[PDB]
Amino acid sequence: DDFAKLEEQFDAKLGIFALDTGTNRTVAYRPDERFAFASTIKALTVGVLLQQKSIEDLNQRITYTRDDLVNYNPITEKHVDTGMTLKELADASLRYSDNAAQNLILKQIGGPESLKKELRKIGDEVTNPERFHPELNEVNPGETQDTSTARALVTSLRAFALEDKLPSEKRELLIDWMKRNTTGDALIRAGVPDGWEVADKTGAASYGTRNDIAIIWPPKGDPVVLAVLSSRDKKDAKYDDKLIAEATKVVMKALN
Ligand SMILES: CC1=C(C(=O)O)N[C@@H]([C@@H](C=O)NC(=O)Cc2cccs2)SC1
C-alpha cells in the first residue's frame, strides 16, 4: 500500500480520512486511530465561537496581559497594551496558530469542557478537548485527553465549514481565515497543485505528532475534506512535513 510505504519511509504512523463531498467517495487509512489533535482544534474552536456570537459580537475587545501569553504568541505578544477583538483573535489563532489567542477564545466560550459539550451537540462524540495550552500538546500513547481521529476531524470540519452548523456569512469567515493560513505551505498545500484553493489548519505536538486538516476545492466539482494525522514512537521525535505532503498526493490520486 502507498500509505504503508510512507509509514515505512518516514518511520511514522499515519491516520488519513478524505471525503469527496461530490461523490461521497472516501479514502481511509487508520481513520479511527486516535492522535493528539494539537492545533487542529483551533479550527473547530472558531466554529463554536462563530455559532455562539453574531458577526458584530466578534468586535468585542478582549483585554489580556503577559500572564495570558504562553509558549507561542506570534500575534498576541504584540498587542498586550491595546488588547485584541475576538475577530482578531480568531484570525491569529487560525492563520498563525497563536496559542494564547486560542486560550483566550477558549475562555470566552466557556473553557475545554464547554467546547466538548458544543462538539457533542454538532454530532462529534470522538474529539476530547480537556486542557489549555500548553498542556494539551503532551499526550502519551494510549491516553484519550485532547485526542481525536481523522474521521471525526473531517466530519466536524465539514459540519462547520460546509454544512448547516453555521449560517453562510459565518462559514465564509471561517473558510477565508483557513484559506489564508500562513503555517501550512509544506503540508496539505504541498500535495495539491498550485491554484487549487485550500483551507487548512496545522498542528504539531509531542511524539512527533504532525497534523493538517483541510478543505480542498478542485478545478470545478465539489470540495474534498481531508485530515492527515501522524505520530511517532519517541516522545522527543522530530516530524517531517514531507510525510503529510506525500500522503496528500496519494489521496488525490485515489480520488482521481
Ligand atoms: C508549529 C506549531 C504549530 C503548527 O504548526 O500548527 N502550532 C502550535 C501548536 C499547535 O499545534 N503546537 C504547540 O504549541 C506544541 C508544539 C510542538 C512543537 C513546538 S510547540 S505552535 C507549534
Curated annotation (Swiss-Prot):
It catalyses: a beta-lactam + H2O = a substituted beta-amino acid. It is a lipid-anchor. It comes from the Bacteria. It is found in: Cell membrane. One of its GO terms (molecular function) is beta-lactamase activity. The active site is at S39 (acyl-ester intermediate), E135 (proton acceptor). Keywords: Antibiotic resistance, Cell membrane, Hydrolase, Lipoprotein, Membrane, Palmitate, Signal. Substrate binds at K201, T202, G203. Induction: By the bacillus licheniformis protein BlaR1. GO terms for biological process: beta-lactam antibiotic catabolic process; response to antibiotic. Its EC number is 3.5.2.6. Large exopenicillinase is the primary secretion product; it can be converted to small exopenicillinase. The keyword Lipoprotein applies. GO terms for cellular component: plasma membrane. The keyword Cell membrane applies. Belongs to the class-A beta-lactamase family. The class A beta-lactamase family has a specific amino-acid numbering system, sometimes called Ambler or ABL numbering and often misspelt as Amber. A multiple sequence alignment was used to derive a consensus sequence and then the consensus was numbered taking into account insertions and deletions. This allows use of identical numbers, e.g. for active site residues, despite differences in protein length. UniProt always uses natural numbering of residues, hence there appear to be differences in numbering between this entry and some papers. This is Beta-lactamase. It comes from Bacillus licheniformis. The gene is penP. The chain holds residues 48 to 303 of 307 of the full protein.
